[PDB]
Design an enzyme around this catalytic site. Structure first.
Site, PDB file in Angstrom:
ATOM      1  CB  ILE A  15      -0.964   0.014   1.202  1.00  0.00           C
ATOM      2  CG1 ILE A  15      -1.544  -1.380   1.448  1.00  0.00           C
ATOM      3  CG2 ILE A  15      -2.086   1.015   0.966  1.00  0.00           C
ATOM      4  CD1 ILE A  15      -2.427  -1.883   0.329  1.00  0.00           C
ATOM      5  CB  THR A  16       6.101   0.494   2.941  1.00  0.00           C
ATOM      6  OG1 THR A  16       4.923   1.087   2.380  1.00  0.00           O
ATOM      7  CG2 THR A  16       6.348  -0.865   2.297  1.00  0.00           C
ATOM      8  CB  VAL A  17       1.214   0.225   5.182  1.00  0.00           C
ATOM      9  CG1 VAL A  17      -0.111  -0.489   5.392  1.00  0.00           C
ATOM     10  CG2 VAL A  17       1.587   1.039   6.414  1.00  0.00           C
ATOM     11  CE  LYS A  29       4.427   2.914   8.596  1.00  0.00           C
ATOM     12  NZ  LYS A  29       3.626   4.159   8.768  1.00  0.00           N
ATOM     13  CG  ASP A 122       4.312  12.128  12.099  1.00  0.00           C
ATOM     14  OD1 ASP A 122       4.159  13.231  11.530  1.00  0.00           O
ATOM     15  OD2 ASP A 122       4.864  11.159  11.533  1.00  0.00           O
TER      16      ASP A 122
HETATM   17  N1  ANP Z   1      -4.181   0.395   9.422  1.00  0.00           N
HETATM   18  C1  ANP Z   1      -4.329   0.743   8.141  1.00  0.00           C
HETATM   19  N2  ANP Z   1      -5.421   0.304   7.473  1.00  0.00           N
HETATM   20  C2  ANP Z   1      -5.573   0.650   6.191  1.00  0.00           C
HETATM   21  N3  ANP Z   1      -4.775   1.397   5.424  1.00  0.00           N
HETATM   22  C3  ANP Z   1      -3.704   1.816   6.110  1.00  0.00           C
HETATM   23  C4  ANP Z   1      -3.409   1.543   7.435  1.00  0.00           C
HETATM   24  N4  ANP Z   1      -2.215   2.143   7.807  1.00  0.00           N
HETATM   25  C5  ANP Z   1      -1.822   2.755   6.715  1.00  0.00           C
HETATM   26  N5  ANP Z   1      -2.674   2.603   5.652  1.00  0.00           N
HETATM   27  C6  ANP Z   1      -2.514   3.155   4.309  1.00  0.00           C
HETATM   28  O1  ANP Z   1      -1.395   2.532   3.705  1.00  0.00           O
HETATM   29  C7  ANP Z   1      -0.491   3.524   3.171  1.00  0.00           C
HETATM   30  C8  ANP Z   1       0.753   3.578   4.022  1.00  0.00           C
HETATM   31  O2  ANP Z   1       0.874   4.875   4.655  1.00  0.00           O
HETATM   32  P1  ANP Z   1       1.969   5.147   5.778  1.00  0.00           P
HETATM   33  O3  ANP Z   1       1.518   4.513   7.039  1.00  0.00           O
HETATM   34  O4  ANP Z   1       2.247   6.641   5.972  1.00  0.00           O
HETATM   35  O5  ANP Z   1       3.311   4.468   5.235  1.00  0.00           O
HETATM   36  P2  ANP Z   1       4.011   4.889   3.898  1.00  0.00           P
HETATM   37  O6  ANP Z   1       4.599   3.671   3.260  1.00  0.00           O
HETATM   38  O7  ANP Z   1       5.154   5.905   4.199  1.00  0.00           O
HETATM   39  N6  ANP Z   1       2.908   5.569   2.827  1.00  0.00           N
HETATM   40  P3  ANP Z   1       2.782   7.251   2.995  1.00  0.00           P
HETATM   41  O8  ANP Z   1       1.451   7.596   3.585  1.00  0.00           O
HETATM   42  O9  ANP Z   1       2.919   7.929   1.573  1.00  0.00           O
HETATM   43  O10 ANP Z   1       3.925   7.778   3.945  1.00  0.00           O
HETATM   44  C9  ANP Z   1      -1.301   4.813   3.101  1.00  0.00           C
HETATM   45  O11 ANP Z   1      -1.992   4.902   1.861  1.00  0.00           O
HETATM   46  C10 ANP Z   1      -2.260   4.667   4.285  1.00  0.00           C
HETATM   47  O12 ANP Z   1      -3.471   5.383   4.070  1.00  0.00           O
END
Ligand code: ANP
Ligand code: A1AHE
Ligand code: A1AHE
Ligand code: ANP
Ligand code: ANP
Ligand code: MG
Ligand code: MG
Lengths: 261, 299, 272, 300
Positions: A15, A16-17, A29, A122
């Site tokens: 979606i 890191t996540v 994550k 944050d």
């Molecule tokens: N618990 C969750 N359930 C569903 N979607 C999630 C969840 N946590 C994060 N996301 C989504 O997954 C992506 C990861 O976001 P993030 O937690 O900030 O890590 P990232 O890899 O740095 N992506 P970014 O938001 O650009 O920084 C984003 O599109 C979030 O909206």
């Protein structure tokens, strides 16, 4: 207790996540680094220790962690989109009652965190998920700390209190800097815009906001915004952190405001 | 206009680039294969292989959360780079979007950025920086004269070199939408921003000259000249303190005066592109004979 | 930790009754449910049930398990959980008679099974699963609650068992009715209760609605002479759901499927 | 058939009930706990609008408001259940998830409670109890075509005047249905035909009386520490209990035997029991039950 054995978590689409499967849908994550640094394990241990102290409907539900194969934190999978996506990507037309309820629920979760002596550090619309288009979930505890009796700038500058940007006080982060970040969220909700949209220079924003020369343009607040909300938002955004209210009082102001609609 | 002229070898190198570029068509993620990682910034850059043409290319991924309309307008505005052809400007191949990231494909520079060469030399010799100064000044003049834009992000990491002796500028503000979109993130630890831009006053290409001067001082002394402090302290130092100066002993008087005229905090008294090209430091290093390739290969 | 100082919880309207204590709507960092033992001289069983429920709830972090938030020891023993605005599945099916579509009926069964799978993976046996203990929230997010009777690795209230408590007869497996085994509870007895919940979902009715004799139900169900009338299942119920319900309701516990297999069957028929 | 004193007491009770109107929760004040059953504590209370001291029972149920309303209306038949052997009814209402049934306070409590203090109950006393139960069941059958459905020592109440009255019978059909899924007990007096799901009638109340009579006679619950299912299995499988020898007259032993025949077709009915030698002898006996009771349980 919350450590998940190796072969239980199924990792899926990035979606890191990642969207994963552990007793149903979960978000995973991970740290893709094969060799975690001390600062990496420090941050990982700090985040798990903070998340395990949280049990509240407006806080993203921590479910467990895995140390093998890669360092991973498992939370509930939220359905829908983030508040940043709603306000600034798809421009969802929230009614004012829902905008206030989103503010109320966000303040609800932050008040819980501060009662647990947790500074989030944050808070931003990207880290507020609108689960099932109904329930605010405050996520991303990667910088969260537990305030106790006993460095480079880190985060998103739009939600940083001037004293956080300056990084000159002995403790730049406080409950009141979380309040300032919440005040920017109120600006997003009541204007539909990010602050400083006319300023396309990141280092200019840093210098001018930290010096108190630049602050959000409160005239962008829509006309349907109640007077008590723009006033609460301005008090959360005070440049001097001791003039900002705390979340118990922010909650009561929103609740009274919500009854007066 | 005289700075805009190319020698015979530069004209042959440019046409050879545009010829190999003519074999490239519409870019797609499926048509690329990674070779190595060229480094990382606040954004990751990979050395890639475009399979349909066989060309070696540099692919930068910019992660942005923006409306699709803004994303498409960025791609449209990046097309201006197809008319930014110069021995001091990095060539451009194409730009596209996939998996939440905007790809920018450009010419590969085996030498890398001048910030990575600094780590492989400690300090950069004065005659080498003379060629760099010439390359930056000419490149800034080309953008202003042919495209009416400034670079607005001059720094050693955005001055790229290669084994063929070339020194080219990169990552300049060609897209108004991309500038706006990248303003709210990509927090850095140091800064080369001019004092007047930090304070929100009127600015022009003079700010790129100030940034070049600070970059030259860094590459000459081997250390970041501002002021360890966090970013706001550095920015505050740029606004409040007098500019840095080059040491008096080793560096020539002309080079010191060159840097000093670049670093004047008042942009109206700061030297401009024309004055700097006819400066004593440029002419001495222009007619000089330096094998920048050999120095780059050893460092 | 999770102990809430007295004074922070505001107790509001009475909402219902749990297996041990009374449940109220309350305020503590937002809406909460507060389950209090409003008894002047509580029995050992009620005290140990409060201790047990807190201990079991602290081991649960899953979207289909009711969110434990804290407890108070003074002035009274109380357990604080999230507040579920949609009340219970029993209320919807048998009080207001909500007409859920089949896709939603199947999804309720799926989330219930999801929560039960999580519990059994942690060796938690609920022992009192029934539609009253399945709470709804948001757009029908299922929350399994009330862990007063639940065991963890066959222990109860932090100790091995010296008795075998029991819950409501309708969801009670025949071997739990008879109380002839030393330990009549198992994952499979939870599965049976889930089967009765499946029967509620697909019939809209409680089982044995024609028999108004408590002792008759105990004898005949325990003897295997009485079992739910599967002809009451609605015609819109998928055949694969009726087959799964029949396997969860098997009189011999060894023939009942476990929840990993139950989930796979629900996810397969939900795809159809 | 009613005596002069029986006709008087009932008239004096119906006159006391004329002082009672619609019942509401705020019109009651607690006094003490009368005892506890599987449904909770029954309370002795005071109805301020009338002043009468009543027993208040709280039945916690989760049911439809419509079914709750029908239960209250079905309970109104109790106003037409007037008999010296039937506990009187004052009214019923709903309040905070429970249905409160208010009834005549019996200051001697239940025979279950009396048995605890007495140990055992002499035969001639149990003859007056047998008459009271048989006359109550016969009244319910002939006047309202209803069984009792829950005869047991705790549902036979007594008072300092020597009266013996039945309570907690199945007057509201929806309340019977509503209470079938909870209120589980640790013992049972249910007839074997009702346990097994076969045809039953007021014959089943005769079984439950016969079982209660044996319990009160020998001072021990006569079925079979077994949990509820094992007791039900015992009632179905094993032959009925019998009175011991050398203690009770043959007429009493034959009376309980004919009550406990497991085949309801051959089990004695209310008409046969009413002319049984045990009842004939007991009816003509002069038994000071009022004085025995007060001395046994400590009433004044
Ligand atoms: N618990 C969750 N359930 C569903 N979607 C999630 C969840 N946590 C994060 N996301 C989504 O997954 C992506 C990861 O976001 P993030 O937690 O900030 O890590 P990232 O890899 O740095 N992506 P970014 O938001 O650009 O920084 C984003 O599109 C979030 O909206
Ligand atoms: C820090 N100073 S600032 O605050 O002004 N920010 C900004 N400065 C300058 C520019 C921008 C945006 C941007 C960027 C970053 C960019 C990067 C690469 C690119 O590809 C090539 N580049 C040169 C030659 C060949 C190419 F293929 C085009 C780009 O075009 C752009 O417009 C900024 F956000
Ligand atoms: C075990 N056998 S069973 O399975 O048939 N269950 C049942 N048996 C019998 C009855 C019922 C329901 C019921 C109950 C419990 C009830 C209780 C009190 C009541 O007040 C008075 N009663 C008599 C005189 C004066 C009163 F004020 C009326 C009641 O009316 C009722 O109908 C059962 F559920
Ligand atoms: N076309 C290219 N050819 C070769 N190397 C390149 C090319 N483009 C970028 N690089 C390398 O990739 C690195 C990462 O660049 P970039 O993502 O722009 O961050 P940066 O300019 O170094 N620092 P910052 O702008 O603050 O993020 C550069 O430092 C170069 O060494
Ligand atoms: N009208 C009354 N006057 C005095 N005591 C009463 C009256 N009604 C009930 N009680 C007492 O209240 C207690 C509880 O009665 P009840 O709730 O009906 O359960 P139970 O008949 O004793 N046992 P069970 O039927 O298995 O729950 C018993 O001890 C009765 O003697
Ligand atoms: Mg760069
Ligand atoms: Mg009773």
């Amino acid at each position: 207790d919350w450590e998940i054995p190796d072969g239980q978590i199924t990792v899926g689409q990035r979606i890191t996540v990642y969207k994963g499967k552990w007793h149903g849908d979960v978000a995973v994550k991970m740290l893709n680094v094969t060799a975690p640094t001390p600062q990496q394990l420090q941050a990982f241990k700090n985040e798990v220790g903070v998340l395990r102290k949280t049990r509240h409907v407006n806080i993203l539900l921590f479910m467990g962690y895995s140390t093998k194969p890669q360092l991973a934190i498992v939370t509930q999978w939220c359905e829908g989109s983030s508040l940043y996506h709603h306000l600034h990507i798809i421009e969802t037309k929230f009614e004012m009652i829902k905008l206030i309820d989103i503010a109320r629920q966000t303040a609800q979760g932050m008040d819980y965190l501060h009662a647990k002596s947790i500074i989030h550090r944050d808070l931003k619309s990207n880290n507020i998920f609108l689960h099932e288009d109904l329930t605010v979930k405050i996520g991303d505890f990667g910088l969260a700390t537990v305030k106790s009796r006993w460095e480079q700038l880190s985060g998103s500058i739009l939600w940083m209190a001037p004293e956080v940007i300056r990084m000159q006080d002995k403790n730049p982060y406080s409950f009141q800097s979380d309040v300032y970040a919440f005040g920017i969220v109120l600006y997003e909700l009541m204007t539909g815009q990010l602050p400083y949209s006319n300023i396309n220079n990141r280092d200019q924003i840093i210098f001018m906001v930290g010096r108190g020369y630049l602050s959000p343009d409160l005239s962008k607040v829509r006309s349907n915004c109640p007077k008590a909300m723009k006033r609460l938002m301005a008090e959360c955004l005070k440049k001097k952190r001791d003039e900002r209210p705390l979340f118990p009082q922010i909650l009561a102001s929103i609740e009274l405001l919500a009854r007066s609609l | 206009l005289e700075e805009l002229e190319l020698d015979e070898q530069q004209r042959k190198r440019l046409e050879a680039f545009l010829t190999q570029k003519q074999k490239v068509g519409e870019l797609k993620d499926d048509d690329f294969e990674k070779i190595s990682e060229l480094g990382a910034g606040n954004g990751v850059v990979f050395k890639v292989s475009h399979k349909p043409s066989g060309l070696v290319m540099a692919r930068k991924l910019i992660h942005l959360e923006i409306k699709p309309a803004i994303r498409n307008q960025i791609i449209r505005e990046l097309q201006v780079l197809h008319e930014c052809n110069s021995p001091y400007i990095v060539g451009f191949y194409g730009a596209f979007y996939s998996d939440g990231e905007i790809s920018i494909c450009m010419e590969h520079m085996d030498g890398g950025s001048l910030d990575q060469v600094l780590k492989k030399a400690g300090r950069i010799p004065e005659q080498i920086l003379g060629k760099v100064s010439i390359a930056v000044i000419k490149g800034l003049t080309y953008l202003r004269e042919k495209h009416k834009i400034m670079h607005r992000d001059v720094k050693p990491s955005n001055i790229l070199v290669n084994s063929r002796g070339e020194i080219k500028l990169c990552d300049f503000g060609v897209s108004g939408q991309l500038i706006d979109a990248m303003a709210n993130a990509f927090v850095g630890t140091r800064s080369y921003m001019s004092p007047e831009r930090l304070q929100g006053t009127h600015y022009s290409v003079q700010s790129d000259i100030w940034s070049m001067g600070l970059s030259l001082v860094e590459m000459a002394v081997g250390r970041y000249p501002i002021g360890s402090m966090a970013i706001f302290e550095l920015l505050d130092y740029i606004v409040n303190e007098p500019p840095p100066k080059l040491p008096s002993g080793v560096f020539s008087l002309e080079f010191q005066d060159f840097v000093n005229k670049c670093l004047i905090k008042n942009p109206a008294e700061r030297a401009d592109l024309k004055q700097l090209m006819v400066h004593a430091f440029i002419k001495r290093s222009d007619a000089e004979e330096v094998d920048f390739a050999g120095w780059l290969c050893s460092t």
